Curated annotation (Swiss-Prot), chains A, B:
One GO biological process term: antibiotic biosynthetic process
Chain positions recorded as S-adenosyl-L-methionine binding sites: 49-50, 77-81, 107-111, 165, 183-184
Keywords: Antibiotic biosynthesis, Magnesium, Metal-binding, Methyltransferase, S-adenosyl-L-methionine, Transferase
This protein's name: Mycinamicin III 3''-O-methyltransferase
Family: Belongs to the methyltransferase TylF/MycF family.
Effect of loss of the gene: No production of mycinamicin II and accumulation of mycinamicin III.
InterPro entries with a match to the protein in the record: SAM-dependent_MTases_sf (IPR029063), TylF_MeTrfase (IPR008884)
Protein's organism: Micromonospora griseorubida
Catalytic activity as recorded in UniProt: mycinamicin III + S-adenosyl-L-methionine = mycinamicin IV + S-adenosyl-L-homocysteine + H(+)
Cysteines engaged in disulfide bonds, as pairs: none
Entry keyword Magnesium: yes
Cofactor(s) the record lists: Mg(2+)
GO terms assigned for molecular function: magnesium ion binding; O-methyltransferase activity; small molecule binding
Length: 248, 248
């Protein structure tokens, strides 16, 4: 109805490529299937995000909620792949003409880390690194930037954090977050980012776990929530993502 | 950038698929080339229009001009292929929340006509029918409708005119046009539509010839303009399209 609604709606359909409905890579529990892209259950060969429409909608709800309710801070995604969700997020801010917040785009830009003997047992058991070729996960900072540019959204309110989260997170140059989107799939990535980034999540802000259904990740989420006495309700989004809103 | 500007801009980039940059069919004067899609010089394997960005921009200018300047009537495209330009056109109306105008989508829905002995010599010399398989031109009404749906724009303000223009135009159910977009490539298609549709083009409205560079088409345009004493300035868009604005 409003121009904002149309843009954002179109942007969602575009980053997920509902428009042209590109094939999926063959991997894990897996030709374009509408119910699969709606819920983010597939591995797109061309689309700029894999999170699907329910998680895009969630992301929109979180950012919009924040802006409306005056929650201060930036938006950060840890694990961006081709950048779609961050593109969308920069889109949301452009739509409401916000020039005081930034979208932080954090990634190895090389896919999943090789497993070390440091790594948590579960992260070792699933070796997400092996699925990198199969799902075209290694995606360079340059490629990601190009994609932003294609939507007309690459600019000084998009900043990049190339590197592993353990290295890039503790000392990253943002002061406060309104939305923290975790999409690392592993215990390590999730723990790395909750540990070093969650403290900067403004009260009122939102924490999103993209793959709560993965046990390694779920473990980290609870270990972290236990440790800090966090009891904010965990709300499901689709078949794998959840989020909570931080109270004081 | 207001929400409207973003939406329309994104829509243009989307129907022309600047976002994902699909391959071109190999034909005529012909891998994605940016300068070619900008000007509508290639034959997209996936994109929803082949007219490129300059002609989309032209289309936008014509529709916006009309709305602003109170020019009454609908929009009609004769020759829509996969529907992109009509999709965009329906988009424009949605963006400004217009519910009193319709987008008319006219086509064989089977590609170019087989050549008969009726046909104009030039249309016979060309036999545009032969390029149908090569450029995936035959596109069913159903397929086109699906595409509209994918942008969330298939609704009761989009009406279809399946058939050859000879048959569909003279008796088509629209009373007045604000924009008439002719994209048939041939003398026949152009003449068919100028003859039977142009008289309903409101004064102030716009007539767009997509293929003025094709001699058969150019012939029809002049023959028609001379016959009716039309001297409205012919303005070039890119390497092949032109348009004029109708005065009284
Ligand atoms: N320890 C770590 N540090 C930094 N980046 C990591 C990491 N572990 C995984 N990643 C990255 O996280 C991403 C996982 S997929 C992320 C999908 C994305 N949110 C979307 O919208 O489609 C990959 O880009 C991968 O390179
Ligand atoms: N005499 C005629 N009557 C009806 N349709 C015709 C016709 N001659 C050609 N066509 C149709 O006109 C189209 C030419 S291609 C048009 C491209 C389209 N405007 C875009 O935006 O990409 C083809 O789809 C073909 O099916
Ligand atoms: Mg994930
Ligand atoms: Mg043409």
């Amino acid at each position: 109805s409003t121009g904002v609604e149309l843009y954002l709606d179109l942007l969602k359909r575009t980053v997920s490529n509902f428009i042209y409905q590109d094939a999926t890579h063959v991997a894990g529990l897996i030709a374009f299937v509408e119910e699969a892209r709606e819920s983010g259950e597939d591995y797109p060969t061309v689309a700029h995000t894999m999170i699907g429409m329910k998680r895009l909608n969630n992301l929109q709800h979180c950012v919009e909620s924040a802006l409306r309710d005056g929650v201060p801070g930036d938006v950060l995604e840890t694990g961006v792949w081709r950048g779609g969700a961050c593109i969308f997020a920069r889109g949301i801010l452009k739509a409401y003409d916000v020039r005081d917040r930034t979208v932080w785009v954090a990634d190895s830009f090389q896919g999943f880390p090789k497993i070390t003997d440091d790594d948590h047992p579960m992260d070792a058991e699933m070796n997400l690194h092996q699925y990198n070729e199969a799902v075209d996960l290694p995606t360079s900072l340059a490629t990601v930037q190009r994609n932003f540019s294609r939507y007309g959204l690459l600019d000084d309110q998009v900043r990049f954090l190339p590197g592993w989260f353990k290295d890039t997170m503790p000392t990253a140059p943002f002061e406060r977050l309104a939305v923290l989107r975790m999409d690392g799939d592993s215990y390590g990535a999730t723990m790395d980012v909750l540990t070093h980034a969650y403290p900067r999540l403004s009260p009122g802000g939102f924490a999103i776990i993209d793959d709560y259904c993965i046990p390694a990740c779920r473990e980290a989420v609870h270990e972290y929530r236990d440790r800090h006495g966090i009891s904010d309700e965990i709300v499901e989004i689709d078949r794998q993502g959840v989020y909570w809103r931080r109270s004081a």
